[PDB]
Amino acid sequence: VLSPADKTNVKAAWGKVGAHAGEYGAEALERMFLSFPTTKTYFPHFDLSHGSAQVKGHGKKVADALTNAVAHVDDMPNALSALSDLHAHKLRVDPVNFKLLSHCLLVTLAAHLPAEFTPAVHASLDKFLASVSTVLTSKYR
Amino acid sequence: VLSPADKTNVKAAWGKVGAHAGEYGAEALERMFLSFPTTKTYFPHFDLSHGSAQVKGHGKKVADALTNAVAHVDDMPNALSALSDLHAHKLRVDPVNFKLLSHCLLVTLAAHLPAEFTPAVHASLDKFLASVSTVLTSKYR
Amino acid sequence: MHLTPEEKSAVTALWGKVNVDEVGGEALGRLLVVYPWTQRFAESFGDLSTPDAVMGNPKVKAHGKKVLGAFSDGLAHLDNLKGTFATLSELHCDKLHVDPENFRLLGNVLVCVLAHHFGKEFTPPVQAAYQKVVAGVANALAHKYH
């Protein structure tokens, strides 16, 4: 459960991301593909090569949904219904994978928002990605 | 979320446990100690020898709690609040261990209720244990 | 794969009593029912809409038998699982694109299946041997992922 401090921390951090979220989305995927190659099983149809437009595009898509989640941090379940659906009934990604992308997302923010990636902000973003993960896998069964 | 179906399944299967819950609780622990030895780090103070009274004593406590969550299937967060607090604040069991116990509980039930341990019931009992685990871990951070 | 001799004899004694045709069907069926997300690999199997539709599907039964078939062979080469499973690991990765976590879910379901079938005979210590085994097989099946 996201505390008010957490919600603040997150909105702040994401606030700084700004026009780069798409690039950070893309970078997080690339880091996930290389560090946890088992995650690639879900993208057989993609060109997973560095700088692929498929990866870039997908990076944006993910980034955008996170934004929308920060924006509706108070009503995630509702803001992400559709996405929760897609993942549970179409994509069917195994839940273990959400933790892997979440981690690559922290790493990416850390590497790009040094000043902002304080210990308290790290804790908050983590909880946040965790909550987002829970929402996305809530209708799995 | 548990469906009506799930609820019926759990009350039914747990119904059958009856008076053996205590012993099945103890057995699930032993199975856990044997298959996932890392879980032992939380019971340095226990006699983990076969037929340990501490283990017997502990299995009963765990079974009583599960029995209590079944009795309050529509209000588990509240029925288990206290236990959720204990685990988050005192015991501080890493979350991954809940899945290990859940697993050993399912093996135990499987081993004792062949007629009831049907595919449908198995699925229901699995979602149930996952939900209990989620409650018990809800106040961790 | 730290199977003590006594753990190995235990695995082997019990495996003696298994009807792989049957266990295979149950394990796979139950996987598709407990973790419905795993159904992503079987859209060509037909109707998996309910437990009965899954457990009884001739396609699921036949596939289960195949899978446990390969697993049984693995049990005769406990010393060289990676070797035993290498072409299969490559296939699952490169052709089937099966997330290896699937191999661990199946191992847990299989353990529940053995518990279901052998009752009291599936003692705490026998379970611990089988736990090491399904983990070894899952690891062997994932060794060639890249």
Place this chain on the structure above:
Amino acid sequence: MHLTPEEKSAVTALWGKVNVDEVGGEALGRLLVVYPWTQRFAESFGDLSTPDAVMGNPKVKAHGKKVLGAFSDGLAHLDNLKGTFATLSELHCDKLHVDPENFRLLGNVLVCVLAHHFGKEFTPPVQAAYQKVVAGVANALAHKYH
């Protein structure tokens, strides 16, 4: 390790630029803050009531340096982490009762700290090699648990 000479060199070269003192204190403190439950082993350290109280606690900082110290020396035996952490693995099991899962939490925290510190320098390929080392270290440390 299943490190590529290239992967070995990347690890090795970044490490050369690391201040173990600072990185050790930050990794351990972040751990205590992100995953509050890991504080169960550091009651004797004092006030860990806040991020600030953790990050400032010298007992934490000094424990952090001891840990990265041992980690650091392990990078010199990357081809036998098992043998390098054998005694430490027994200690952790038999004396400290530390659940090996903590080793994995730390590892991930470590990677976040390195990224934090090195920004640009900590590229996807470099993170990949580091992920293999942290996993490797955690496995070695957990190896003697029974």
